[PDB]
Amino acid sequence: RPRQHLLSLTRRAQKHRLRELKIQVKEFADKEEGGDVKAVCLTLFLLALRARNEHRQADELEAIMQGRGSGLQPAVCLAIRVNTFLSCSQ
Amino acid sequence: HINKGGRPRQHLLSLT
DNA sequence: CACAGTGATACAGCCCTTAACAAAAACCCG
DNA sequence: CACAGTGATGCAAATCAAGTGTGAAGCCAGACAAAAACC
Numbered sequence: 001r002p003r004q005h006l007l008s009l010t011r012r013a014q015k016h017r018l019r020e021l022k023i024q025v026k027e028f029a030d031k032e033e034g035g036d037v038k039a040v041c042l043t044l045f046l047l048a049l050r051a052r053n054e055h056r057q058a059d060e061l062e063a064i065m066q067g068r069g070s071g072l073q074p075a076v077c078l079a080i081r082v083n084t085f086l087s088c089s090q
Numbered sequence: 091h092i093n094k095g096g097r098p099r100q101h102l103l104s105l106t
Numbered sequence: 107c108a109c110a111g112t113g114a115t116a117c118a119g120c121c122c123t124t125a126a127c128a129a130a131a132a133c134c135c136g
Numbered sequence: 137c138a139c140a141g142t143g144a145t146g147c148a149a150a151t152c153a154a155g156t157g158t159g160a161a162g163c164c165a166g167a168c169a170a171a172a173a174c175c
Contacts, residue, residue, distance in 0.1 A: 001173050011162090033102045043102055051122050089141055095133040 006014065029040040042065070049058045063069055072080075080086070 001175095029102075033099065036102060039101075039103050043105075047122095053122060055121080087141075088143055093134055095135085097130095097132045 003017075006017070025041060026037060029035065029037055033040060042061075046058055046061070049055070049061075081088070
């Protein structure tokens with residue numbers, strides 16, 4: 001049988017296709033950087049997204065890594081709501 | 091072996 | 107010299123790729 | 137029986153801080169083993 005799409009694969013059944021690539025990730029990041037793996041697949045996906053030219057999802061991944069920018073101050077929502085002539089119902 | 095130096099390998103999160 | 111829009115259009119600037127040279131700092135030890 | 141605002145008020149409902157010590161669950165290990173959609 002021919003294979004199917006990689007993101008349609010579940011949490012389990014994508015192992016026989018990435019079991020090979022993971023180990024040359026592991027050994028390279030051990031002998032080069034010092035042992036980090038999440039960091040060296042983080043920055044590779046950053047480079048893939050930026051050669052892909054999708055900087056918005058890159059900065060959203062930066063948002064999931066660092067502290068979230070969810071939540072504005074009530075002062076800046078007040079400044080927005082009164083400076084763009086918004087109503088309170090709108 | 092002799093140590094030949096270099097700029098030390100910074101951690102990949104602290105590179106550009 | 108009122109001034110903060112009102113939207114479409116145009117263009118520019120900044121950021122990826124190739125691959126090879128370059129200005130330059132960080133330690134090693136003769 | 138026009139209908140979507142217009143904002144303050146006030147009541148209800150939802151969340152949460154906290155103790156510490158539990159349960160529930162995802163998942164690592166490599167390997168062993170059936171469903172199944174094509175030739």
